[PDB]
Structure formats: structure tokens, C-alpha cells
Amino acid sequence: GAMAPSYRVKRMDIAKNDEECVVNAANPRGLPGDGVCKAVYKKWPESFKNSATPVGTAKTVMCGTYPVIHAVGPNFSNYTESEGDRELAAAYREVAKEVTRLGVNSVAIPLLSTGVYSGGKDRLTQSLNHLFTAMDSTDADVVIYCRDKEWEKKISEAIQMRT
Ligand SMILES: c1cc(-c2ccc3c(c2)OCO3)n[nH]1
Ligand SMILES: c1cc(-c2ccc3c(c2)OCO3)n[nH]1
Ligand SMILES: [Cl-]
Numbered sequence: 001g002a003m004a005p006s007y008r009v010k011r012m013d014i015a016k017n018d019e020e021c022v023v024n025a026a027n028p029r030g031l032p033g034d035g036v037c038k039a040v041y042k043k044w045p046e047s048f049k050n051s052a053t054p055v056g057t058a059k060t061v062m063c064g065t066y067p068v069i070h071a072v073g074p075n076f077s078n079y080t081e082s083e084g085d086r087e088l089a090a091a092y093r094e095v096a097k098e099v100t101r102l103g104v105n106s107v108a109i110p111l112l113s114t115g116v117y118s119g120g121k122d123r124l125t126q127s128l129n130h131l132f133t134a135m136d137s138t139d140a141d142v143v144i145y146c147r148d149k150e151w152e153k154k155i156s157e158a159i160q161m162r163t
């Protein structure tokens with residue numbers, strides 16, 4: 001575990017992370033995808049061997065010895081708000097199981113279902129709160145990666161508010 005487990009947020013490509021493993025915002029079919037998923041495909045293509053996994057689950061595949069945790073958030077275009085909320089919470093619980101199993105001291109994580117699976121809604125708070133619900137009981141240092149300047153500020157505020 002980390003000596004003083006923390007949350008941090010950085011505004012940069014998660015493919016450039018400085019953590020011991022990465023979470024991919026994966027699609028269920030293990031396809032290269034878009035956004036975070038395509039960045040992860042470019043950096044760790046070997047990790048897409050048999051990475052297909054259902055919505056609400058995570059499946060880890062090693063790129064060398066570097067673990068890629070493929071976490072499949074729901075696409076809110078297809079799910080009801082209620083069912084999507086349940087699957088988004090479930091994906092993050094499976095990420096916490098994998099991070100724990102791997103024994104890493106740090107993990108790079110995107111906000112699941114906030115991009116093209118958002119169904120056109122701002123889900124920063126919904127996705128971040130499910131991240132915290134899952135990761136709070138882990139002792140890994142968590143580094144959240146985002147692209148938007150305003151999201152960075154809002155994620156940073158939410159982290160600092162609970163310290
Ligand atoms: C294509 C674009 C990017 C990207 C991701 C996050 C960023 C960023 C660029 O500039 C500010 O924060 N990664 N692949
Ligand atoms: C649309 C979204 C992105 C993207 C790629 C990598 C990222 C990211 C966003 O947020 C952190 O790591 N590229 N084009
Ligand atoms: Cl997404």
C-alpha cells in the first residue's frame with residue numbers, strides 16, 4: 001500500500017501516467033474505441049488480447065508487466081438512468097478488486113461514462129462519487145486523469161473538500 005494513500009487529479013493524457021497500472025475506459029468488445037480507450041490502445045495495444053468483458057465489469061490484461069484494467073462503464077445512450085447508475089457503480093467496485101488483487105501502490109484512473117458514454121449529460125459528480133465509493137477502502141495512491149480545465153478544478157475541489 002501507499003504510506004498515506006491519497007487522491008490527486010491531473011489534466012493530461014492517461015497514456016503518459018506515472019502510476020503502477022492504468023484503468024482503461026473500455027468498451028465491452030475490446031475494440032480500440034475513442035477518447036481514453038483509443039489513447040490506451042495506442043500506448044498498450046498488447047493489453048487488448050481477450051480484453052472483452054461485460055458492462056459493469058473490469059478485466060485486467062498485462063502489457064509486458066504493466067497492468068491495464070479494462071473497466072466497462074455503461075453507455076447512458078442505451079441504459080436507463082437507474083440501470084446505468086447501478087452498472088457505473090459496479091464497474092468501479094470491480095476496479096477496486098483488481099487494484100487490490102494486483103498489489104499496486106498507485107493507479108491511473110479516468111472518470112468512467114463521462115465521455116461518449118455520458119448520453120450527452122455532465123456526469124462528473126456521479127462518476128467521481130462512484131469512484132470514491134469503490135476506491136476509498138483501497139490503500140493505493142489514486143491519480144485521476146481528465147482533459148477539461150473546468151473538470152480539473154471541480155475534481156480537485158471535490159478531493160480537497162474531504163481532506
Ligand atoms: C489525444 C488528445 C489527448 C489529450 C488528453 C488530455 C489532455 C490533452 C490531450 O491536453 C490537455 O489534457 N490525448 N490524446
Ligand atoms: C477525446 C478525449 C480524449 C482523451 C484522451 C486521453 C485522456 C483523456 C481524454 O483524459 C485523460 O486521458 N481524446 N479525445
Ligand atoms: Cl466514456
Ligand SMILES: [Cl-]
Binds near residue numbers: 151
Ligand atoms: Cl475531462
